[PDB]
């Protein structure tokens, strides 16, 4: 999407995993969709260093919406919810330095069956501009062809931009054709700042393999099509929740980074451990995610329960992670030729390794003709950032 | 197994999960399978509260054996990874005030292909005294027929037995067995300390998932076998390693004592972080564990991917558990009616529930009518103990 927008992958919070569609605000407060959660989460992202971190985007998802239009035939936040509504909020959040997201539908209903945008694209996005609204996921639910999937997608993207308001524009479409047609990305970049590929993360380690598998698998298909302005995005950061171990998350944080996916955390900010914390704010990390040039990695290889991935950053330098897959013993020793790495640029004449994951460390030169051993903790990642020299 | 051993479930190290058959000490000798491991293991269990915590039983699994047997046909631990031989080793550990124990196998092989024990049963079992050991983990490899399955293990018993040394007998006899015919466990019970009933865990939270499930599945079978001398086995610990979240940790401490589940760590001493630590150092929940009266708990409820679990205790105590399988969200609330614990003797006229894990806490006092209501974290335990007021 040529809109300015999203030149780097987006980041933010998104309530979705962590949070899903409770109403149950009397016996859950705490994990209710409302505006407090909301306002609370903006005053965190704010205070505990995720806004300089660069988390940016803080975005509402489904189950915000009052259950039917007003009379006007404009959408409405839950009175009870969200009393005090959506431009309000949005007040709230740009006064914290952020910028707010929201969620709706293609289809007549959004997922969990609240009014949809079919027949209102228009009245929608002028109503979310008027709002303050700064992003907008669209869901791909209760739509009966792949004409009206594709029709109310492009659609609602240049309704948006008729707005004359910049509003990141982040799309299911893909995800939607793929039980029918496969995509045509070319067409999706040119309506969408990013689009779900795969099917929803959840808080599991399972989750993560089978994205990273299906991403390598279709990596022919997809690694090409993103670039600044249009990225693949394979679901939220689950970082900081219950189901991943340390490594595992280290896993997660190294591909997404290694993948040039938009970073949406879904967790709760007010409930996290030091460690993910520190994680989900590497800045070395996120500058790999954030690489200007603005090139998706890859899976360059793959077998004995290994993967080396990588990823070509601005200034011939290269990040690559190292995966292990065996999921049983301990720390498994990897040599590969630094000549392999980078298409073989990297380490020409020679590059400076820098070991970010799981733990920072200098690890010297390499010269163009040389060996890197490395041990990789099972199920975890070790990222490497490779700089080109000619020094020693 | 009568012999005055595993009153309590037997609580130790074992190498397997965590180390495997790593011979390659020229390459990686600090992770090798070497009498150097053993040792530094042996001395961190000492110096690092392991032992205090109840941790006795140093354990060699497989892997450890020269290729061949020695002149008058006795096993020969491997020259080059164990040069001072066992019983060398044994008497390391006995000065470190802990137990050494051993692996074989009752087929013609052991699973990594080392030599079998079959035609050497006395032999080995005399063999092993002589050397010191305290406990005899036998595998079932490489044996081709179940009558000979259960003819080995019940001759090494015997064989063990007859040494004179009290020497606890760890038996895979069930799981080898299972595939082909249901195991008698009265028999297994009169011939094995413990015993393996499902697959090898491993470094993953769907291995803790499976053996929960294959337990609760047959626990009808299993449950009431089990006691003071003659455990299930669920298989090795591992927590400190690297696969599993802490409430998944938390999830594996906790059902292993609600199980009265052998705990045998296979982890790196070494390298172990200060959570894993005292999760696995937790006293109240060993006291669970270990509990006198040594009656396995079970699965209470299962539902909207919700688990209760209990277990009986010494003095009118229950143990319960309660696991959210749903994997992903937030905590979810799930609420039982105190009556409906401990078979309804629990809470009458009232009981004051302590929640252990993940974090001790003090609940306070629940009347016979009381309804108890937690948030469980996905594919975390909430581990509680309820004791009646009389
Ligand atoms: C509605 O849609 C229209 C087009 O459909 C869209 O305008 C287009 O996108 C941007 C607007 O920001 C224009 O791109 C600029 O073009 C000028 C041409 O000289 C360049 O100088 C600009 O370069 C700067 O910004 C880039 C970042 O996008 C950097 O890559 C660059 O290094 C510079 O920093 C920039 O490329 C584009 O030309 C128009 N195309 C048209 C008008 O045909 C408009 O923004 C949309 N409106 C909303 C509200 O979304
Ligand atoms: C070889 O097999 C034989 C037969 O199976 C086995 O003999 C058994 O030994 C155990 C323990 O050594 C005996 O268990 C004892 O039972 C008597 C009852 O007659 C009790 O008095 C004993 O009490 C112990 O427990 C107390 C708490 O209750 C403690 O204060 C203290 O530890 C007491 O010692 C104990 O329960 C069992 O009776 C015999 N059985 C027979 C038939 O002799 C022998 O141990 C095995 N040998 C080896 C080397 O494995
Ligand atoms: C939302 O529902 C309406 C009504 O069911 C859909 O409109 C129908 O569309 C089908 C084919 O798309 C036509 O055969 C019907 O004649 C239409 N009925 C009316 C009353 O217009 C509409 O297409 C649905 N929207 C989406 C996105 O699926
Ligand atoms: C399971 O094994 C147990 C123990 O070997 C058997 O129980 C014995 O049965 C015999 C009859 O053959 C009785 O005389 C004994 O008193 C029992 N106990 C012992 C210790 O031998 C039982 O029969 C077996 N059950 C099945 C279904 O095979
Ligand atoms: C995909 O869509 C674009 C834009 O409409 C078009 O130029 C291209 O030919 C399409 N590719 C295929 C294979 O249909
Ligand atoms: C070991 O091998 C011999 C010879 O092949 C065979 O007769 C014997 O039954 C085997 N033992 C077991 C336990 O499989
Ligand atoms: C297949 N994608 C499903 C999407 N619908 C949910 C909202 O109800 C979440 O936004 C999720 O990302
Ligand atoms: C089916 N059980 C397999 C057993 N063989 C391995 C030794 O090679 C471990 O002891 C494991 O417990």
Same mark, same amino acid.
């Given at each position: 999407?040529?809109?300015?927008?999203?030149?780097?992958?987006?980041?933010?919070?998104?309530?979705?995993?962590?949070?899903?569609?409770?109403?149950?605000?009397?016996?859950?407060?705490?994990?209710?969709?409302?505006?407090?959660?909301?306002?609370?989460?903006?005053?965190?992202?704010?205070?505990?260093?995720?806004?300089?971190?660069?988390?940016?985007? @803080?975005?509402?998802?489904?189950?915000?919406?009052?259950?039917? /239009?007003?009379?006007?035939?404009? +959408?409405?936040?839950?009175?009870? /919810?969200?009393?005090?509504?959506?431009?309000? +909020?949005?007040?709230?959040?740009?006064?914290?330095?952020?910028?707010?997201?929201?969620?709706?539908?293609?289809?007549?209903?959004?997922?969990?069956?609240?009014?949809?945008?079919?027949?209102?694209?228009?009245?929608?996005?002028?109503?979310?501009?008027?709002?303050?609204?700064?992003?907008?996921?669209?869901?791909?639910?209760?739509?009966?062809?792949?004409?009206?999937?594709?029709?109310?997608?492009?659609?609602?993207?240049?309704?948006?931009?008729?707005?004359? /308001?910049?509003?990141?524009?982040?799309?299911?479409?893909?995800?939607?054709?793929?039980?029918?047609?496969?995509?045509?990305?070319?067409?999706?970049?040119?309506?969408?700042?990013?689009?779900?590929?795969?099917?929803?993360?959840?808080?599991?380690?399972?989750?993560?393999?089978?994205?990273?598998?299906?991403?390598?698998?279709?990596?022919?298909?997809?690694?090409?099509?993103?670039?600044?302005?249009?990225?693949?995005?394979?679901?939220? @950061?689950?970082?900081?929740?219950?189901?991943?171990?340390?490594?595992?998350?280290?896993?997660?944080?190294? @591909?997404?980074?290694?993948?040039?996916?938009?970073?949406?955390?879904?967790?709760?900010?007010?409930?996290?451990?030091?460690?993910?914390?520190?994680?989900?704010?590497?800045?070395?990390?996120?500058?790999?995610?954030?690489?200007?040039?603005?090139?998706?990695?890859?899976?360059?290889?793959?077998?004995?329960?290994?993967?080396?991935?990588?990823?070509?950053?601005?200034? @011939?330098?290269?990040?690559?992670?190292?995966?292990? /897959?065996?999921?049983?013993?301990?720390?498994?020793?990897?040599?590969?030729?630094?000549?392999?790495?980078?298409?073989?640029?990297?380490?020409?004449?020679?590059?400076?390794?820098?070991?970010?994951?799981?733990?920072?460390?200098?690890?010297?030169?390499?010269?163009?003709?040389?060996?890197?051993?490395?041990?990789?903790?099972?199920?975890?990642?070790?990222?490497?950032? +490779?700089?080109?020299?000619?020094?020693?």
């Amino acid at each position: 999407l040529d809109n300015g927008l999203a030149r780097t992958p987006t980041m933010g919070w998104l309530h979705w995993e962590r949070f899903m569609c409770n109403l149950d605000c009397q016996e859950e407060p705490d994990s209710c969709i409302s505006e407090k959660l909301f306002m609370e989460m903006a005053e965190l992202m704010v205070s505990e260093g995720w806004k300089d971190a660069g988390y940016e985007y @803080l975005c509402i998802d489904d189950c915000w919406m009052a259950p039917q /239009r007003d009379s006007e035939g404009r +959408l409405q936040a839950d009175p009870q /919810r969200f009393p005090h509504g959506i431009r309000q +909020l949005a007040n709230y959040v740009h006064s914290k330095g952020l910028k707010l997201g929201i969620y709706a539908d293609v289809g007549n209903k959004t997922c969990a069956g609240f009014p949809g945008s079919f027949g209102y694209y228009d009245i929608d996005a002028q109503t979310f501009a008027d709002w303050g609204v700064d992003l907008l996921k669209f869901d791909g639910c209760y739509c009966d062809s792949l004409e009206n999937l594709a029709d109310g997608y492009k659609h609602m993207s240049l309704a948006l931009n008729r707005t004359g /308001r910049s509003i990141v524009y982040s799309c299911e479409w893909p995800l939607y054709m793929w039980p029918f047609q496969k995509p045509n990305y070319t067409e999706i970049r040119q309506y969408c700042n990013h689009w779900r590929n795969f099917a929803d993360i959840d808080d599991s380690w399972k989750s993560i393999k089978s994205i990273l598998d299906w991403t390598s698998f279709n990596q022919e298909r997809i690694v090409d099509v993103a670039g600044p302005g249009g990225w693949n995005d394979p679901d939220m @950061l689950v970082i900081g929740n219950f189901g991943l171990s340390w490594n595992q998350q280290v896993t997660q944080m190294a @591909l997404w980074a290694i993948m040039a996916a938009p970073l949406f955390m879904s967790n709760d900010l007010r409930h996290i451990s030091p460690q993910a914390k520190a994680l989900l704010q590497d800045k070395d990390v996120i500058a790999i995610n954030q690489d200007p040039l603005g090139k998706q990695g890859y899976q360059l290889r793959q077998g004995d329960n290994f993967e080396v991935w990588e990823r070509p950053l601005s200034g @011939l330098a290269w990040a690559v992670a190292m995966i292990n /897959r065996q999921e049983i013993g301990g720390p498994r020793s990897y040599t590969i030729a630094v000549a392999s790495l980078g298409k073989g640029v990297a380490c020409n004449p020679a590059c400076f390794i820098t070991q970010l994951l799981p733990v920072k460390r200098k690890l010297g030169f390499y010269e163009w003709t040389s060996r890197l051993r490395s041990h990789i903790n099972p199920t975890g990642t070790v990222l490497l950032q +490779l700089e080109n020299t000619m020094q020693m």
